[PDB]
């Protein structure tokens, strides 16, 4: 896609003031506070009116908030299941590993509205283990096409491939 790449580049073009504006609004909707709505509209609407396959409003809002609180540099080949597999194959397999596995597996039963907080938990686990990179574009596409079966199959397959190295 190209709307996603432009959206991510625009998000990384922000400075500390607008990042703080987005950071103050975690856990909130889009139609609540005017400064957040204005910032997100001015960042997203030209891309939507240009590219027909730009990310939807809810997905783009969720990625904007996650980037605000969990600022990671954009890199290719650093998807969420790969990093979760790399982290998960370092703990004992009796107590901690089933807990982290259950936390990762909760995401399959949630829709796109109720997914900011588990993703925040996963990214907090990533940040606790000295991670400084993430693939925002691939995560945005996966969240955009989520209720399908092949996307979840590829998600779990990438997790298994990272876990069984």
């Amino acid at each position: 896609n190209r709307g996603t790449v432009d959206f991510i580049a625009s998000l990384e073009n922000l400075k500390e003031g607008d990042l703080g504006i987005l950071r103050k609004l975690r856990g909130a909707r889009l139609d609540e506070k005017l400064p957040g709505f204005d910032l997100f509209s001015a960042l997203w609407w030209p891309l939507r009116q240009k590219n027909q396959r730009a990310p939807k409003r809810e997905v783009a809002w969720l990625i904007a908030k996650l980037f605000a609180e969990f600022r990671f540099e954009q890199r290719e080949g650093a998807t969420l299941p790969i990093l979760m597999g790399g982290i998960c194959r370092k703990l004992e397999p009796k107590k901690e590993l089933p807990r982290v596995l259950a936390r990762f597996d909760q995401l399959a039963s949630l829709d796109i509205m109720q997914m900011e907080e588990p993703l925040s938990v996963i990214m907090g686990i990533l940040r606790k283990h000295q991670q400084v990179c993430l693939d925002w574009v691939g995560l945005t596409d996966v969240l955009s096409f989520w209720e399908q079966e092949p996307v979840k199959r590829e998600w779990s397959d990438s997790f298994i491939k990272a876990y069984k190295i």
């Binding site: 139609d31 005017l34 400064p35 204005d38 509209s41 001015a42 409003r57």
Partner: protein, 350 residues
């Protein structure tokens, strides 16, 4: 050229061609349609009963050479079938098991006299009675009269003029197509060969059912040299249309201006110079919309409308500003925008 052979396609979700080893309770398919099986299908096509067929119609029909090509060789599935005696008189229940061939396809070629083949093909286009595959609980999934006849040659040549149909893109295929053919006389090899098996599928009578042995030979075929792989038609996977609206193609850019002239440059609810257009019914987008699907609005009212339908879960029927039920919420959102917006942020972002 007069037709010589006749083609029959036998394919269904379930089918079963019984064999002689089914004697008491367990009923087994052999591997493929038998001569007696297909010559009950042809008899039921021309409406010949169980009587009056043995003396006249069966001897002429049994004077044929037929061969079966097998694709999707089928997976045998067993069924626990109970027959309730009572509901002699007893409350007993009889148990049995019946075998079916799941996901199978067979191509039968019957070669013989021309006008007999023409009569058979004319009968198959509108059968007199119901046509099934072995047992009455198994209807075909593809039409039996699907391939045209012709003045072909011996059965190996007749089993090569039909393409191998597929169903979806990644459909796995076999490299080998086994085929089962009737043995052929000719007085050079007058005695039966070593690799010939014996099948009990030569029908004589049907009401006191009578079958006779028939020598059966086996051969093979390879895809790409004898049969050419065909392709599926139509669309299998069904998806809703769900056309995401586009604001860059020419058709929408002209429809939007036409709507902006239909309403005389005035926002609908607050009556200010309109600068944008908001959709109501979304099931026309992509460049096919009508001017009655669109409503003219200004920046403040369209921002209020966008706020009012962010996470409301509306798929095709969005907010209609002309509706007098949405007036209060739009006015309240407009008041909030007027009270809390900052022009400096928007001017700085662009």
């Amino acid at each position: 050229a007069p037709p010589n052979t006749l083609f029959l396609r036998l394919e269904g979700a379930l089918q079963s061609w019984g064999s002689n080893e089914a004697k008491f309770a367990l009923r087994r398919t052999a591997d493929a349609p038998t001569k007696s099986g297909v010559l009950g299908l042809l008899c039921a096509a021309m409406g010949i009963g169980r009587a009056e067929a043995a003396d006249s119609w069966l001897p002429k029909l049994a004077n044929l050479r037929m061969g079966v090509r097998i694709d999707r060789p089928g997976i045998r599935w067993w069924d626990f079938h109970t027959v309730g005696a009572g509901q002699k008189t007893r409350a007993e229940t009889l148990l049995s098991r019946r075998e079916y061939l799941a996901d199978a396809s067979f191509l039968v070629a019957l070669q013989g006299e021309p006008e007999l083949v023409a009569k058979l093909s004319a009968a198959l286009a509108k059968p007199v009675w119901a046509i099934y595959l072995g047992r009455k609980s198994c209807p075909p999934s593809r039409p039996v009269c699907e391939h045209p006849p012709g003045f072909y040659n011996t059965l190996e040549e007749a089993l090569s003029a039909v393409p191998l149909q597929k169903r979806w893109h990644n459909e796995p295929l076999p490299q080998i197509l086994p085929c089962v053919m009737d043995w052929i006389p000719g007085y050079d090899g007058e005695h039966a060969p070593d690799d010939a098996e014996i099948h009990y599928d030569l029908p004589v009578s049907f009401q006191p059912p009578r079958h006779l042995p028939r020598f059966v030979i086996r051969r093979e075929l390879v895809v790409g040299e004898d049969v050419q792989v065909s392709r599926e038609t139509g669309t299998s996977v069904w998806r809703p249309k769900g056309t995401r609206a586009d604001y860059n193609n020419s058709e929408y850019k002209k429809v939007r201006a036409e709507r902006l002239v239909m309403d005389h440059a005035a926002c609908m609810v607050c009556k200010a110079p309109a600068t944008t257009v908001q959709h109501v019914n979304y099931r026309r987008a992509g460049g096919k919309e009508i001017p009655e699907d669109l409503r003219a609005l200004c920046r403040l009212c369209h921002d209020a409308c966008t706020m009012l339908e962010y996470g409301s879960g509306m798929t095709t029927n969005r907010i209609d500003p002309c509706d007098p039920i949405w007036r209060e919420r739009i006015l309240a959102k407009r008041k909030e925008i007027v009270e809390f917006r900052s022009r400096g942020q928007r001017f700085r972002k662009m």
